[PDB]
Design a protein around this nucleic acid. Sequence first.
RNA 1: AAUAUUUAUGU
RNA 2: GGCUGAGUAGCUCAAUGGUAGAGCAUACCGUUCAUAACGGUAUUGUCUGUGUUCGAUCCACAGCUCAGCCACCA
RNA 3: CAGUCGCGUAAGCGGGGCAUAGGAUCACAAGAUACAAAAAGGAAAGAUCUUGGAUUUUUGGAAAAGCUACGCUAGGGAUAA
RNA 4: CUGAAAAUUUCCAGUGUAAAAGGUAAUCGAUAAGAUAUAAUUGAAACACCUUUAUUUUUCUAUCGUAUUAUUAAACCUUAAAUUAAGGAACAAUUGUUAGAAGACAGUUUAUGCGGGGCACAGGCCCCAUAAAGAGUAAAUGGGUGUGUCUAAAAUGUUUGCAAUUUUUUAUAGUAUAUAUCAAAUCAUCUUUAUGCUAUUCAUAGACCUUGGGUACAGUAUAAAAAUUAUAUAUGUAUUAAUUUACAUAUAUUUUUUCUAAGAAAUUAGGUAAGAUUUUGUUUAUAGAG
RNA 5: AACAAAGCACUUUGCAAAAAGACGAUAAGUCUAAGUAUUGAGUGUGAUUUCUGCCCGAUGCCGGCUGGUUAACGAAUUUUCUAAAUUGAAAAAAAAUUUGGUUUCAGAGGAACCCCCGGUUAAUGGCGGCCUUAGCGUGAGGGUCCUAAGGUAGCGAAAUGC
RNA 6: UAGAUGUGCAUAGUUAAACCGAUCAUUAAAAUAAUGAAUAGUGUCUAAAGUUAGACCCGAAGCCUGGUGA
RNA 7: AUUCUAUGAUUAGUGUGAACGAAAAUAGAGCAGCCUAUUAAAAUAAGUAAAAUGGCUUUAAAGCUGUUUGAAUAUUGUGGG
Lengths: 48, 195, 74, 242
Amino acid sequence: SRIINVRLISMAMTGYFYTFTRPRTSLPMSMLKYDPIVRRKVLFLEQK
Amino acid sequence: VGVIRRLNVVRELLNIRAGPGAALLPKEVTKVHMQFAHRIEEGHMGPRKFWRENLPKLKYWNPAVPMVINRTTDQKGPAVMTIYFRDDKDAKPSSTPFPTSSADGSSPAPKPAQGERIVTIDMKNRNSSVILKEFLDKTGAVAVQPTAKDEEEFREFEDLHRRSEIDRERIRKMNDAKKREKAMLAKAMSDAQSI
Amino acid sequence: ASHRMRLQDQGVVVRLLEDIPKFGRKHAIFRIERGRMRNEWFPKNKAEYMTPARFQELGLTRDAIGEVDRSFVI
Amino acid sequence: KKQYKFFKSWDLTGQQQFSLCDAMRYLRAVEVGQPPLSVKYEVHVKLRTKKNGPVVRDRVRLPTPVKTDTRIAVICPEGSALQEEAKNLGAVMAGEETLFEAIRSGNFPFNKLLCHTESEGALRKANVGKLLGPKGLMPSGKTKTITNNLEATFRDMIGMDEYRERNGVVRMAVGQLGFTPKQLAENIRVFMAKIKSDIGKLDDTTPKMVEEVVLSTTHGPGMSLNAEFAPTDDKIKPEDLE
RNA sequence: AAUAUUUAUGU
RNA sequence: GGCUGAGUAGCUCAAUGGUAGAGCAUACCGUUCAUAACGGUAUUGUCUGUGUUCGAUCCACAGCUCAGCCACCA
RNA sequence: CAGUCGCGUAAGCGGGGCAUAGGAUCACAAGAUACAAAAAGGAAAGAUCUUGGAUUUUUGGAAAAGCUACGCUAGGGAUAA
RNA sequence: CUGAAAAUUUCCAGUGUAAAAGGUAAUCGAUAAGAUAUAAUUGAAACACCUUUAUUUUUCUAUCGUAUUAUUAAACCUUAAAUUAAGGAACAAUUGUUAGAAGACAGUUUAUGCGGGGCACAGGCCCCAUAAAGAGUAAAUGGGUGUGUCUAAAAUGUUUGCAAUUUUUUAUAGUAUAUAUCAAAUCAUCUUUAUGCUAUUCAUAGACCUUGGGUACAGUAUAAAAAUUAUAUAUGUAUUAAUUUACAUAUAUUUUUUCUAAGAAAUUAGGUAAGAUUUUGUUUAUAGAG
RNA sequence: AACAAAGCACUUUGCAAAAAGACGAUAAGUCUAAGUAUUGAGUGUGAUUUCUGCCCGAUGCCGGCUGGUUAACGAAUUUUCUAAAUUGAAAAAAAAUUUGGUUUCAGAGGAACCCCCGGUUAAUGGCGGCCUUAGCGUGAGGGUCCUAAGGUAGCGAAAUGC
RNA sequence: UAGAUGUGCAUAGUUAAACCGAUCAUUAAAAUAAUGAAUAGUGUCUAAAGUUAGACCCGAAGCCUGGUGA
RNA sequence: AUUCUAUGAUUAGUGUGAACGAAAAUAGAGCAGCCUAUUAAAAUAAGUAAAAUGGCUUUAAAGCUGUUUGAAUAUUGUGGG
Ligand SMILES: [K+]
Ligand SMILES: [K+]
Ligand SMILES: [K+]
Ligand SMILES: [K+]
Ligand SMILES: [K+]
Ligand SMILES: [K+]
Ligand SMILES: [K+]
Ligand SMILES: [K+]
Ligand SMILES: [K+]
Ligand SMILES: [K+]
Ligand SMILES: [K+]
Ligand SMILES: [Mg+2]
Ligand SMILES: [Mg+2]
Ligand SMILES: [Mg+2]
Ligand SMILES: [Mg+2]
Ligand SMILES: [Mg+2]
Ligand SMILES: [Mg+2]
Ligand SMILES: [Mg+2]
Ligand SMILES: [Mg+2]
Ligand SMILES: [Mg+2]
Ligand SMILES: [Mg+2]
Ligand SMILES: [Mg+2]
Ligand SMILES: [Mg+2]
Ligand SMILES: [Mg+2]
Ligand SMILES: [Mg+2]
Ligand SMILES: [Mg+2]
Ligand SMILES: [Mg+2]
Ligand SMILES: [Mg+2]
Ligand SMILES: [Mg+2]
Ligand SMILES: [Mg+2]
Ligand SMILES: [Mg+2]
Ligand SMILES: [Mg+2]
Ligand SMILES: [Mg+2]
Ligand SMILES: [Mg+2]
Ligand SMILES: [Mg+2]
């Protein structure tokens, strides 16, 4: 469909992740989220 | 092109280590400088064949002997060969200057240094075999003997040349009739298409 | 290529007794098609099955099995 | 009727391969008397890549210049570490009182002339300006040839080497017949390494793999090159000569 | 010497 | 998610790396003593975009749309 | 309440949208937790937490077309002539 | 596209049937001429030779598939107590496995709701009225162009005449205050003190001009900067050991961020801070303008 | 008025070991038949006179490509766990490679049905329109669209007619 | 004589579960920070009951298997 | 050792569900061991164990089995579980 559910992987290599949706014809998501494993805000990047 | 296609080519071209004009010159010789002309006029064919047939084999077995060749467009010139056979009685001290090969008289025969009593050789209207003969005996090289596999290499490729030429005539003849037939039919029918 | 293939029979071990041409000389051990030995050689007493007991009587081992010689001639 | 995506790849198990040293021993022999600066090595790297994919179009700056269209000559002190350094950078006939007689000969191999600021005094003493002037090769403040750093000057005037990926092979001259096994060796390392980098950043959907690399001269056979560098013949050691 | 396209109408 | 075919003028159809055509449906003219037939001409131009090549209806990629079977079908 | 980020001089505000219209389990797939490990050391297959794919649209969630005037049984007159 | 040997690539023009690219100036002719190629012409692209690659085509090898032949020369099958027979024959037949396939046959489903049933139609959720001034409240009730959506937010610094903003560092005096200093915040103001130009004046070969020097004294500010780079080439002139150097032309550049309107465009929607607070329609008037 | 029926027509059957068809938890085998294409079986029609037209697109059947697809098979691939060894690490340590066992992924080529081509109507079946006309009507006629082809001969308020 | 022997339930809770334990679970480190969970059982009789069996009683059409009859 | 009854046990476990459902062990009834079997049998077991595949049974193991294949020689560590 027009929408896809992407997964943002933690760059701390802790395995935590966030799941958001965004249109296919859009740039990959990249946000600064909170990692509960290390309890700090790190960079989360889209899996693919 | 395949891996075996090229192998059969290079291996054949790898006759640099073979029978004709192949030997390990003694440690007394350091370098050589030949000088001939471009064309073959005035007894210039001999020295050329020696450079394209036998000389390449001398470099392989003895790759530490500079063999420079000067060329000149002035035929009827000195077709000589200066063999630096001395080495100053096997003395390590090296003479700094020495030229490099080129096309137009850029590197004339350098004059021998102090410990450089050299023997020269002349070659004009003389067959390469005569030049090669005097070369080996005078230089005193020990001819290398081709091992079994080396002699096997000659036998194998010798058969390829048999089948090769046998195939050249066939594919050539198959194209002879094709090109001939296509022309005959073309000369017959299309001659009407002109109208 | 794969990790499992169709199971096949490599033949039956036999020792020649009549020096069959195109196969082997007399007293030659090798594997032959079960059909030829069963229908042609064994009835005519041209060969014999090499049973484990036969190997002991003759003193040979299982490592003496040869191969058929198609180029053999009497 | 049928078509294939990837370029044909031939099994290399049979291929007799040669080490660089052993390989040069053969190529040098064929090029026994040819001019040393007109015969140049060359490499044909076979890349396992699809037909409809992109192609490499980058450049490289080799350790030693290959193109001989611009022949450089440096007027530097004789026997000095810089005199040999000039040769490492690719200089020809460089040194003190070595070309000054060549300038008097009337035939110049070099296409350009450098004079280190230290050797500037010897230039005026030679009084060869009247000969270099008409040729348009006389150094000057505006010539940008009187420099203290030679290596920087070399990289500026020479430029870089351009290599383009054709159907299934990248072809570029890497060495000159007058190269030593050490120089030519490093020169190849910088070539295949740069390709790997570009190929690495090119794309990941279908990374291209170097299948085989062939070394050849202008008039020599194309022999498969093995990764090894040392000669297999124990008696034969690295030799350098014209 | 044995060739052969098509041509309706006119208070 | 995976793979394949595909459409050219109003209408119906050709043209495969090289001119972009044919037929028809109106219209004008010519031919004929005259009419009908016949003949000539005229436009209405490669699904869209991009890229490769001196050069693209033609080859490559993406999409529109049509079509083949697929993938999922908890 | 704890953790730690953003904006703001500050107070303070923020656990999506001014409010009211998007279905589970099971199975499967991607991560984490270190619980148990069928003799024992491992593992498999399981358990806990997070997450994704549903005209599961008969939407508290069956993979499902008709005829009988040859018709049958149990009921209803809770629906007809 | 199993590998080997050999060969094969036409628009026009072009010597002619240019596979493509990389490298190269010579290559061959047994001793004398010549063919070849670089040049020259054509073309977008130019050739020998040496390398690695592209398309296609024969034979050979290799892998598959089809067909035929032989078999008391004892597979098996058929006639036949059943054989040195006849015919068929590695097929057929049978077993296992695999795919397709006849409602021929078997099991089961085909629902329920509905002012009787059949056909049709209906099944979750949102807003309004019915609804009787809390909430709730039915009907195959009345409204609806309702809805299984959308949305990641964006494209020596400091103005040159002098303690003037906020916070902080450090130091001195000082007994907590005071001054200076440092860093940061707010802001890209552009900075050659004259090397060019302008005017005038001496000389100077020169029949108005050539060549080189001086001079100018600046608030009515000034000739004393209204915007000053760096080159590549060609053509000159004058110059030097020297395309050395200085000028004058032109034409390709970059530099001074300094001249093709994004403050002329894009309907971007959440957190927080600040700012703005009638934006629509109506109505009065207004070149083309109804 | 239904069934059968003589007649008519189509498909099938070459008999070399089983003619086809039918029966046989399933075979040997039996009927067919001590028959042989003018035989047997199956299907529709239903003596005879006069006749039986058009369409092979759809459906079914038949024939056909060294074609496409193509399960089994299979060139080329690939993975889990564990034992031992080597390398690596040699800090609290894995990890990687080879071999053994164990357990997965995987598909160039490669059958029929099917796709594709042709044939067959006494095979199952199908057998239309809209304009214009010598004056109003009526269309010999003409033009046009569509289809595999457009209901022909005959019969006709019929057992068929609201 | 002596020793042993014979289902079970309760005596401690907690969590998905083990470790743990009057404490335990969640907080990716833990720590009164909060929240949830803690105190007499067992046997027998009488009676009423849940579950599985015919399961309060009577009643189908039909389905399958083995036999009987022309 | 086998057999019979009860508990273990509406358990482990399987299965979408509905439901199906062990064994160890314990108690009791009986109790008996052997190959020289108290009636006359083995030179210690090969197309077997086992594998792939199609099924049965079942928890995936073990056991049964059509088809195609196909091992080893004893605690001095051989084979099954
Ligand atoms: K009736
Ligand atoms: K026969
Ligand atoms: K905002
Ligand atoms: K108002
Ligand atoms: K009838
Ligand atoms: K038809
Ligand atoms: K048909
Ligand atoms: K047909
Ligand atoms: K396949
Ligand atoms: K009619
Ligand atoms: K259970
Ligand atoms: Mg076999
Ligand atoms: Mg008339
Ligand atoms: Mg265990
Ligand atoms: Mg419901
Ligand atoms: Mg509800
Ligand atoms: Mg049925
Ligand atoms: Mg109310
Ligand atoms: Mg009320
Ligand atoms: Mg808003
Ligand atoms: Mg307004
Ligand atoms: Mg009749
Ligand atoms: Mg029969
Ligand atoms: Mg009738
Ligand atoms: Mg398989
Ligand atoms: Mg095929
Ligand atoms: Mg008919
Ligand atoms: Mg307890
Ligand atoms: Mg009777
Ligand atoms: Mg029991
Ligand atoms: Mg035993
Ligand atoms: Mg078994
Ligand atoms: Mg086991
Ligand atoms: Mg088992
Ligand atoms: Mg067993």
